[PDB]
């Protein structure tokens, strides 16, 4: 019945450096329990009974607190450490886990790359038009997107897709898809992409023109 | 060695019910105790319950009575998991998890992902996405294969039948109204396109289908 | 007698990492003291006889040193700490206190807003017009004014006064004010204000015209 | 518990003297050292001296001499400094202070800001400030309220009677000479105004003045 | 015959922080040594059997580590810290050396000035014309340089050369030189010198015309 | 104290050879190891070999065999070592070191910077480097003197005679053909050029050469 908050909910940090990762309980706990979970991979046990290391675990994790404030730390971050981290708890059955802190690997600034698409006369035939603009590459994952349709914002029938932090260079891409009907696209001429990033003030904008 | 296997997806409709199933090995299936986790998509892990085979022992969490029905088959093999109500609550991925006494878990299984609509198995698009017309900006072409409308998850997009891979970006599906949306971004250089054939390849194992679509300049 | 010099005289930390924070004497010192003063509140004891901690201060906070070269440090930085820091000495009569270690909070790079104003009509009755350029919301503190008269730069009669970083966003804001008489203001048309931040080399211009 | 207690501020001619007080309770005023610090702007803490009321043992910094004269009145309850010569030197923050024997610190009074200057009681006079002729860029719209020449301090600036808080940024004064200059800074919505009334409300207690400025568009 | 390997090769420490260098051993080792290496000046001995300290060394360095896997560890970084740091082994005769851990200091981005010159007169009577584009204080070192003859870009003939890291304000100054017969620069007219930096994307660009 | 000198440069063509000495002093000459280290611009350190003049032992590492034949004088004074062979690969800075017993070491002796090269002894030439026609941008003017085609090193190179030394960047030489090309840039203000007179001097002691270059404005 214990509810466990695990602090911060996003870490970022650079490879080579001591990170700790905080949980907190709500009333006393005697063991506490952490999990590792890769993406698109099943979780597994790393520290059992709250210090103890479960086999196969690497030299560089340990975990330490007591009561209601617990503790994991990584002496030393690697590239293979990229994951969501969960706490877990008993003697109060529930038996419960918390929030999930997302170790995120930290890398230098990033501005996105943008193309945007027209909708394909393959859609068009049906009745539907889906115009696609791609935010590639950038750092960190935060970013805002407006769409302009002849200068007018356009909110409904956004549809917005992130990626998971990329292997080899670690950046972030998502996908922005504005859907409309055959009637909503040939009413209107201009259409606009804009992306609104931490790394730049002033908005990347690709944009194209329907009678063109 | 201990390895957990379960099936990959289950599909049913809302009301009906599902038995999940977990193949044990590597280890003495009766010695140690099962556990059941559901986990979904922005709101974290959630214990279900747990039995023992010995000396039999079945626990559940208060918010999972009566969704769940657990049971044991030792011959074959198995852990089982019975859900019985089905709502669109229930659409989430659950685990199979190996564990010495309560209660914690070591090994975990494959996971099985359950998908709780009333939408029918239909069959995908696919549309090529060519840029604007004349030039693109650069050096580096940026192309795109547009899936739209089809269920369930998941397809297998290869660019050029797998002689194409490197800085291709595949994104994630969304759900729009009973039919997942997925694009795909490739970007090459000027030199190769289009002087060379590119082509997305898509494959719906559900709905039997294989699409090939040529990106055509505008 | 003895002189304390604090190093660094600014301190700049996020929230959640170590903080050492050192004070270095003239001679031998048996003991040392730590004081702790938020903006607009008396200050308070944190540290006496070298490491022992004082009634009412929390469980972060600790001491060491010897001789000449003493700590005070903070294992785990909080919001509530951003305050200036004070050494203390005896055993040498005075008594005397070092320069004041300012810790101030982290924040991610902020750039300045800017909004020029021309003198009011009230004031113009009097015979005097004072200029008033707001620069409000910058990260850090740091940041250079340039009041230019219709091309040419002004150096006398500036007025120049900050505030103290703020405890939601934690960014600095400044008020730059020039004075000048009926005569002097009606003499000239165009009247800028210029910030140079260290966010951009490109300087944040705003400006108007007298006869507008 | 332990509470020293000293009043707002005192403000007196060079040459003429000052005698300031401190209230202590919470504690048994007899049993522990009173120790007087001086704080100025940017140049750091200046320790003074202290008084044991015991044994009555009066201690002084040498800069200080005679400069100030510690004095201590146990009925009633208080403890006394006089500054003696008063110059421009001395404008400071003084700083009353409890500590168990030579020489540490544990408690600190509310502190009494001295302004020793010639200059004369004045009152203040409020200006409105206008964004430029036409229209301001963006959605969010600026307004100032500037104070210029007033003595003494303080001058409590509010933002519609108290109905406007949020973005609000108050700007320190400086001394211009005799007489102190102020300026604060308001950040708005352009659909607020020049549509609902703004105005910027100062009043002066050493005056008795209430002043409340309409900004009018220019 | 054991092959030492120093990671990283190329260290940015800012100073008055904890500073870990580490060398790893193809198989192991009994003891390990240390060599401080300032540049335009002989090396030296810090650190003997593995954590001993040399005679006239600094108390704020330390070492250790087994085996394999040893380390070099600076407590507090100093000004006089940066240089380059050497592994040392035996126990195998050879008696290797590792590649070297340059621990360079740590600056607030810089943007590079750029100075282009024409080719002088007196080099133009011998037949020669070298046009040199000097690149002063940036950070950090990594940069790019990009020669355009008329638009198109030249690759052969340049030559680039790097100063170490200043004492005072800490940045980097490159020399970049093109060097043409007296034909092939009297054939074109306009001479560009790009530069690259990781500051800005957009190239900072200085250029001048032959006839003129 | 414990100093070991050794002769500043080295200069011989490929195919003959080269006696490298080292000045002791400051120690019992006979008693601690001597040792050799070659140091290379990006390769990094690598150790030739050590003598022991006791007890004479003499170590060689077995990638120098027989490049260097290591021997020492004793009354008077130094340890010696010969270079056989000689070829491009042998171009390195070749370092004295002191250490007591096998293997490291103590003290480091200057440096002898070895440069084998079938180039002969040749004059710099010094080009004065003027900015664009007409004026510079901004208030800080930036002017160069390019020294091109001299062997072998160093070159000294000092602005006004050795009055101008603050905002000077003089860039290390880079080998091009047989004869090396160094230049230097110095940043000054507006008000001091053309109204002074600045001029770049360069001497080379190889050659017994002597210029002073005046930068005309263009």
């Known amino acids: 019945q214990i509810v466990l908050t695990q602090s911060p909910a996003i870490m970022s940090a650079s490879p080579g450096e001591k990170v700790t990762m905080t949980c907190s309980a709500s009333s006393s706990v005697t063991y506490m329990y952490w999990y590792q979970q890769k993406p698109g991979s099943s979780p597994r046990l790393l520290i059992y009974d709250t210090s103890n290391l479960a086999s196969g675990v690497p030299v560089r994790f340990s975990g330490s607190g007591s009561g209601t404030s617990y503790s994991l730390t990584i002496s030393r971050m690697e590239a293979e450490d990229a994951a969501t981290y969960y706490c877990?708890?008993?003697?109060?059955?529930?038996?419960?886990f918390g929030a999930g802190t997302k170790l995120e690997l930290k890398r230098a600034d990033a501005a996105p790359t943008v193309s945007i698409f027209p909708p394909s006369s393959e859609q068009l035939t049906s009745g539907g038009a889906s115009v696609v603009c791609f935010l590639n590459n950038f750092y960190p994952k935060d970013i805002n997107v407006k769409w302009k349709i002849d200068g007018s914002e356009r909110q409904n029938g956004v549809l917005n897709s992130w990626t998971d932090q990329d292997s080899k260079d670690s950046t972030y891409s998502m996908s922005s898809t504005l859907t409309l009907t055959k009637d909503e696209y040939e009413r209107h001429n201009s259409y606009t992409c804009e992306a609104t990033h931490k790394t730049s003030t002033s908005p990347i904008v690709k944009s194209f023109n329907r009678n063109e | 060695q201990v390895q957990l296997q379960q099936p990959g997806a289950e599909l049913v409709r809302p009301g009906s019910s599902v038995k999940l199933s977990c193949k044990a090995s590597g280890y003495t299936f009766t010695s140690k105790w099962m556990h059941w986790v559901k986990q979904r998509p922005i709101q974290g892990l959630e214990w279900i319950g747990n039995?023992?085979?010995?000396?039999?022992?079945?626990h559940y969490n208060q918010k999972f009575k009566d969704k769940a029905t657990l049971t044991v088959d030792k011959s074959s093999s198995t852990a089982y998991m019975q859900l019985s109500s089905l709502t669109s609550e229930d659409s989430a991925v659950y685990y199979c998890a190996r564990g010495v006494t309560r209660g914690y878990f070591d090994v975990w299984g494959t996971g099985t992902t359950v998908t709780v609509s009333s939408a029918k198995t239909t069959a995908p698009s696919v549309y090529p996405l060519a840029p604007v017309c004349g030039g693109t900006t650069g050096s580096s072409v940026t192309l795109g294969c547009l899936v739209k409308g089809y269920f369930p998850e998941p397809v297998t997009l290869t660019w050029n039948s797998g002689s194409l891979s490197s800085g291709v970006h595949t994104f994630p599906a969304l759900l729009q109204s009973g039919l997942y949306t997925l694009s795909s971004s490739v970007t090459v250089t000027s030199n190769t396109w289009p002087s060379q054939t590119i082509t997305c390849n898509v494959a719906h194992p559900a709905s039997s289908t294989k699409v090939d679509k040529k990106i055509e300049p505008r | 007698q003895i002189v304390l010099t604090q190093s660094p005289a600014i301190m700049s930390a996020s929230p959640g990492e170590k903080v050492t924070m050192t004070c270095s004497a003239s001679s031998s010192v048996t003991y040392m003291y730590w004081y702790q003063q938020k903006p607009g509140s008396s200050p308070r004891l944190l540290i006496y006889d070298t490491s022992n901690l004082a009634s009412g201060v929390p469980v972060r906070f600790s001491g060491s040193g010897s001789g000449t070269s003493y700590s005070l440090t903070i294992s785990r930085m909080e919001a509530e700490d951003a305050a200036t820091?004070?050494?203390?000495?005896?055993?040498?009569?005075?008594?005397?206190?070092?320069?004041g270690t300012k810790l101030e909070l982290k924040r991610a790079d902020a750039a300045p807003t800017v909004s020029i104003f021309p003198p009011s009509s009230e004031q113009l009755t009097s015979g005097g017009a004072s200029v008033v350029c707001f620069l409000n919301n910058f990260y850090p503190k740091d940041i250079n004014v340039k009041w230019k008269i219709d091309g040419s730069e002004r150096q006398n009669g500036v007025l120049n006064s900050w505030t103290d970083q703020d405890s939601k966003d934690s960014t600095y804001s400044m008020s730059s004010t020039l004075t000048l008489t009926k005569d002097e203001y009606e003499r000239h048309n165009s009247y800028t204000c210029e910030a140079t931040h260290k966010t951009s080399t490109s300087p944040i211009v705003k400006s108007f015209n007298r006869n507008e | 518990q332990v509470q020293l207690q000293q009043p707002g501020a005192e403000l007196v001619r060079p040459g003429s003297s000052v005698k300031l007080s401190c209230k202590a309770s919470g504690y048994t005023f007899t049993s522990k050292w009173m120790h007087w610090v001086k704080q100025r702007p940017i140049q750091g803490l200046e320790w003074?001296?202290?008084?044991?009321?015991?044994?009555?043992?009066?201690?002084?910094?040498q800069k200080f001499k005679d400069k100030a004269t510690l004095t201590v009145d146990k009925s009633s309850s208080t403890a006394y400094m006089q500054l003696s010569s008063l110059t421009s030197e001395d404008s400071a923050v003084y700083y009353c202070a409890r500590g168990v024997t030579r020489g540490y610190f544990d408690v600190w009074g509310t502190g009494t800001t001295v302004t020793v200057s010639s200059a004369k009681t004045t009152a203040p006079s409020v200006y409105p400030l206008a964004p430029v002729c036409g229209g301001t860029t963006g959605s969010s719209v600026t307004l100032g309220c500037l104070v210029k020449g007033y003595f003494p301090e303080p001058v409590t600036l509010t933002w519609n009677s108290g109905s406007l808080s949020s973005g609000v940024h108050t700007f320190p004064a400086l001394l211009q000479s005799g007489l102190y200059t102020l300026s604060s800074s308001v950040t708005v919505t352009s659909n607020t105004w020049p549509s609902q009334t703004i105005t910027c409300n100062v009043a002066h207690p050493a005056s008795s003045t209430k002043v409340d400025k309409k900004i009018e568009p220019r | 015959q054991i092959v030492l390997t120093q990671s990283p090769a190329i260290m940015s420490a800012s100073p008055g922080e904890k500073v870990t260098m580490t060398c790893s051993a193809s198989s192991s080792v009994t003891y390990m040594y240390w060599y401080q290496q300032k540049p335009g000046s002989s090396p030296r001995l810090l650190i003997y059997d593995t954590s001993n300290l040399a005679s006239g060394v600094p108390v704020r360095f330390s070492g250790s580590g087994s085996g394999t896997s040893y380390s070099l560890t600076i407590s507090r970084m100093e000004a006089e810290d940066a240089a380059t740091?050497?592994?040392?082994?035996?126990?195998?005769?050879?008696?290797?050396?590792?590649?070297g851990t340059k621990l360079e200091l740590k600056r607030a981005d810089a943007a590079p000035t750029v100075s282009i010159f024409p080719p002088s007169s007196e080099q133009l009577t011998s037949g020669g014309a070298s046009v040199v584009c000097f690149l002063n204080n940036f950070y950090p070192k990594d940069i790019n340089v990009k020669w355009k003859i008329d638009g198109s870009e030249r690759q052969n003939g340049v030559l680039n050369s790097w100063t170490d890291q200043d004492s005072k304000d800490s940045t980097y100054s490159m020399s970049s030189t093109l060097t043409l017969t007296k034909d092939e620069y009297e054939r074109h007219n306009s001479y560009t010198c790009e530069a690259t930096h990781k500051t800005s994307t957009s190239p900072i660009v200085k250029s001048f015309n032959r006839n003129e | 104290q414990v100093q070991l000198q050794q002769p500043g440069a080295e200069l011989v063509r490929p195919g003959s050879s080269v006696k490298l000495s080292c000045k002791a002093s400051g120690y019992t000459f006979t008693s601690k190891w001597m040792h050799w280290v070659k140091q290379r611009p990006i390769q990094g350190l690598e150790w030739?070999?050590?003598?022991?003049?006791?007890?004479?032992?003499?170590?060689?590492?077995q990638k120098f065999k027989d490049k260097a034949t290591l021997t020492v004088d004793k009354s008077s004074s130094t340890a010696y070592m010969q270079l056989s062979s000689l070829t491009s690969e042998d171009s390195a800075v070749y370092y004295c070191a002191r250490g007591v017993t096998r293997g490291y070491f103590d003290v480091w002796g200057t440096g002898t910077t070895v440069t084998v090269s079938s180039a002969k002894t040749t004059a710099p030439s010094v080009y004065p480097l003027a900015p664009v026609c007409g004026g510079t941008t901004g208030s800080s003017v930036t002017l160069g003197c390019l020294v091109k085609g001299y062997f072998p090193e160093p070159v000294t190179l000092t602005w006004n005679s050795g009055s101008l030394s603050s905002g000077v960047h003089t860039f290390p030489a880079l080998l091009q053909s047989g004869l090396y090309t160094l230049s230097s840039s110095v940043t000054v203000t507006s008000n001091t050029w053309p109204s002074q007179t600045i001029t770049c001097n360069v001497a080379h002691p190889a050659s017994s050469t002597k210029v002073d270059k005046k930068i005309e404005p263009r």
């Open positions: 039995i023992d085979p010995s000396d039999s022992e079945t």
């Open positions: 877990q708890q008993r003697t109060n059955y529930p038996l419960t």
